[PDB]
Amino acid sequence: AFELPNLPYGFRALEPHIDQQTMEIHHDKHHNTYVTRLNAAVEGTDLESKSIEEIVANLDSVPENIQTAVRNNGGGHLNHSLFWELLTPNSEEKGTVVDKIKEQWGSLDAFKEEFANQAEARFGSGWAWLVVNDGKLEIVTTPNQDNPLTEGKTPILGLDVWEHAYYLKYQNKRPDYISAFWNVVNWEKVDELYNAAKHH
Amino acid sequence: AFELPNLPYGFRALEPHIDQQTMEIHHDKHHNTYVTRLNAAVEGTDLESKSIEEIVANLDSVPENIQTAVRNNGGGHLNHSLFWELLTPNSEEKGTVVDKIKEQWGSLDAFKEEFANQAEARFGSGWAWLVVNDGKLEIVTTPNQDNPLTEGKTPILGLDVWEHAYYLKYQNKRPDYISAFWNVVNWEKVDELYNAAK
Ligand SMILES: [Mn+2]
Ligand SMILES: [Mn+2]
């Protein structure tokens, strides 16, 4: 019952910051595999009528024998679903969260530096996040497909630092990928996620 | 200080099983970074004079202020040092450990099936291993740069399943990379590691 969402732009739309080949394989193979395996895990359980956000927020209540499959593949589905919507060929560094970041870090650039440092320091596979914890902004990273929702922090920006997300264009140069990412951040979607969670 | 060992072959030697671009970056960037960071962690400490095998076996006793850096970068140095010597352009599927595999699994094919299954199922970054555990052969996987020595098991074959090890040639197709690996396994090195197992 979970479905692979179409990208909200073309595979080529994020060039030259993220290559078309990566956008295609990352979406049509990696994300698709998470959807297939999530559906196999939840099929015939009462997870199958729940939102992915409810499942990932409540992984501790997922039946023991499927909890790892749901953590990994449910996490994969939520994280990539967020990621596609958080990218745009028309990125503008403005809006409510940019203003909150400038207030807290003193500048957007100082925030980008801390986010880049944490994203680079995430050893192995995982994600770098800006989260809202009970109205407050924090940078965190997670391993594999873990999502801050599970820890009661609402993600409003995420960067995939699995090597599949950057290896074809950047190989070992994760810092260059992180630098490229700023050019395609959908700050409108960041604002939408923040606004939804500041009053929830 | 720890040093980056040269490969025993050129970057093209494992073509067309593993691509030259990967061998170059994997060795001269990824492994090199582990050595740099390991040396920074152990420099001027009681660890500096210890073998990387003794250090990784005994991570439990590494001071907390450097334990993560030694785990990740010490593991990275040991794991890649093993990996380069366990690959060859002149693979021959025979010897002491092939015979011992058949005594456990019944066939090399049955061993390869279990190895491929565990290697494919390792979620995120890590390694698939054949180990000696109190004289018995077992397949295990580890996350990130963790190594079976830390659990008192002796690694005798390892496959890197970090995406950097296979993405340029195989992209998402980790199973095709695992299949290609068999063509370049150095079973003489496997035998050497087995014969030395403590
Ligand atoms: Mn991904
Ligand atoms: Mn590696």
Side-chain angles (χ1 to χ4, degrees):
Chain A
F2 296 101
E3 297 186 0
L4 182 67
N6 292 342
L7 290 179
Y9 36 73
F11 295 115
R12 302 181 282 129
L14 305 186
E15 292 278 10
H17 313 294
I18 309 173
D19 52 298
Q20 159 183 10
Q21 180 181 20
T22 294
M23 295 300 302
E24 281 185 299
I25 299 172
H26 199 186
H27 177 273
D28 288 357
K29 297 297 186 292
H30 292 269
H31 189 178
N32 192 55
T33 290
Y34 292 134
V35 172
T36 300
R37 286 170 176 194
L38 173 61
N39 283 332
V42 302
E43 195 178 1
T45 85
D46 55 21
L47 297 183
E48 75 186 334
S49 53
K50 306 194 158 5
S51 76
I52 190 61
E53 293 85 2
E54 176 178 350
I55 291 170
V56 171
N58 296 291
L59 283 173
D60 61 13
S61 85
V62 168
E64 189 175 300
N65 286 7
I66 61 169
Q67 192 175 119
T68 295
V70 174
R71 170 179 193 171
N72 289 347
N73 296 289
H77 175 46
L78 173 57
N79 296 342
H80 293 83
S81 292
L82 285 165
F83 193 49
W84 311 135
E85 291 295 318
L86 282 163
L87 301 168
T88 179
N90 286 133
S91 176
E92 300 179 311
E93 290 173 336
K94 66 182 189 182
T96 70
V97 173
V98 163
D99 290 348
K100 295 280 184 179
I101 287 170
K102 294 200 286 195
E103 184 173 50
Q104 180 164 337
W105 276 270
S107 69
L108 185 59
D109 196 77
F111 160 86
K112 288 196 275 185
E113 182 181 348
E114 186 190 331
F115 185 101
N117 285 340
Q118 288 204 40
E120 168 60 9
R122 168 47 64 171
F123 192 72
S125 303
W127 288 78
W129 309 94
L130 179 59
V131 300
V132 287
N133 22 64
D134 90 316
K136 184 149 330 78
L137 292 180
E138 187 187 16
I139 298 163
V140 299
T141 70
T142 60
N144 303 325
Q145 298 298 343
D146 293 1
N147 184 287
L149 268 185
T150 307
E151 299 168 75
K153 302 173 174 175
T154 299
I156 67 171
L157 181 62
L159 175 63
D160 190 354
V161 296
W162 288 56
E163 281 166 335
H164 64 241
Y166 65 82
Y167 216 78
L168 291 183
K169 178 171 179 78
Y170 297 101
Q171 300 87 49
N172 57 294
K173 299 176 283 175
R174 192 193 288 181
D176 288 357
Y177 165 62
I178 297 160
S179 291
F181 167 65
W182 303 119
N183 294 282
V184 290
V185 171
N186 185 359
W187 288 104
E188 292 190 311
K189 181 66 185 190
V190 176
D191 283 358
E192 175 200 298
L193 290 174
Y194 176 79
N195 289 329
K198 73 185 177 197
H199 288 329
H200 173 96
Chain B
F2 295 103
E3 297 181 84
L4 182 67
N6 287 349
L7 301 175
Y9 37 73
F11 293 149
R12 297 191 274 243
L14 305 186
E15 294 271 17
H17 304 112
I18 306 175
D19 53 296
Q20 56 196 275
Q21 182 180 21
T22 294
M23 293 302 303
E24 176 164 10
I25 298 173
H26 198 186
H27 180 273
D28 283 358
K29 292 298 185 295
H30 291 271
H31 188 178
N32 191 55
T33 293
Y34 290 133
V35 172
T36 297
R37 287 179 179 185
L38 171 62
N39 280 330
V42 305
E43 184 171 29
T45 76
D46 48 12
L47 301 179
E48 186 151 34
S49 55
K50 287 174 187 202
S51 75
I52 190 54
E53 291 84 1
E54 171 170 15
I55 289 169
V56 169
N58 293 288
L59 281 177
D60 199 22
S61 308
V62 177
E64 280 200 57
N65 54 351
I66 65 172
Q67 187 167 308
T68 294
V70 173
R71 177 166 179 185
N72 289 347
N73 296 291
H77 177 45
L78 174 56
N79 296 343
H80 292 85
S81 292
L82 286 169
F83 194 50
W84 310 136
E85 296 287 326
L86 283 162
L87 301 167
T88 180
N90 307 311
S91 180
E92 183 171 7
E93 293 184 333
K94 66 145 176 152
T96 300
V97 171
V98 167
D99 291 348
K100 195 66 173 178
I101 282 169
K102 291 159 58 182
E103 291 182 344
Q104 179 69 48
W105 278 272
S107 66
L108 190 59
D109 277 347
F111 157 83
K112 288 184 180 164
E113 181 164 334
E114 182 181 341
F115 190 98
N117 285 343
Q118 287 207 40
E120 175 57 8
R122 167 49 62 172
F123 192 73
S125 301
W127 288 77
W129 308 97
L130 178 58
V131 302
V132 187
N133 178 11
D134 271 358
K136 182 76 91 64
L137 293 184
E138 301 183 337
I139 299 167
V140 303
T141 72
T142 59
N144 304 324
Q145 298 300 340
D146 294 357
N147 183 287
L149 276 183
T150 311
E151 339 262 272
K153 308 173 176 192
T154 304
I156 67 175
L157 183 60
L159 176 64
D160 190 353
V161 295
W162 288 56
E163 281 169 332
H164 65 241
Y166 64 85
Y167 214 77
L168 292 179
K169 182 173 173 73
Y170 296 103
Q171 299 87 52
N172 58 297
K173 301 186 305 293
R174 192 190 291 181
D176 290 352
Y177 166 60
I178 293 157
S179 297
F181 171 60
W182 303 119
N183 297 123
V184 290
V185 169
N186 189 346
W187 290 99
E188 293 181 299
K189 180 60 180 188
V190 175
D191 285 358
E192 179 200 289
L193 292 176
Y194 175 86
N195 291 337
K198 296 286 64 221

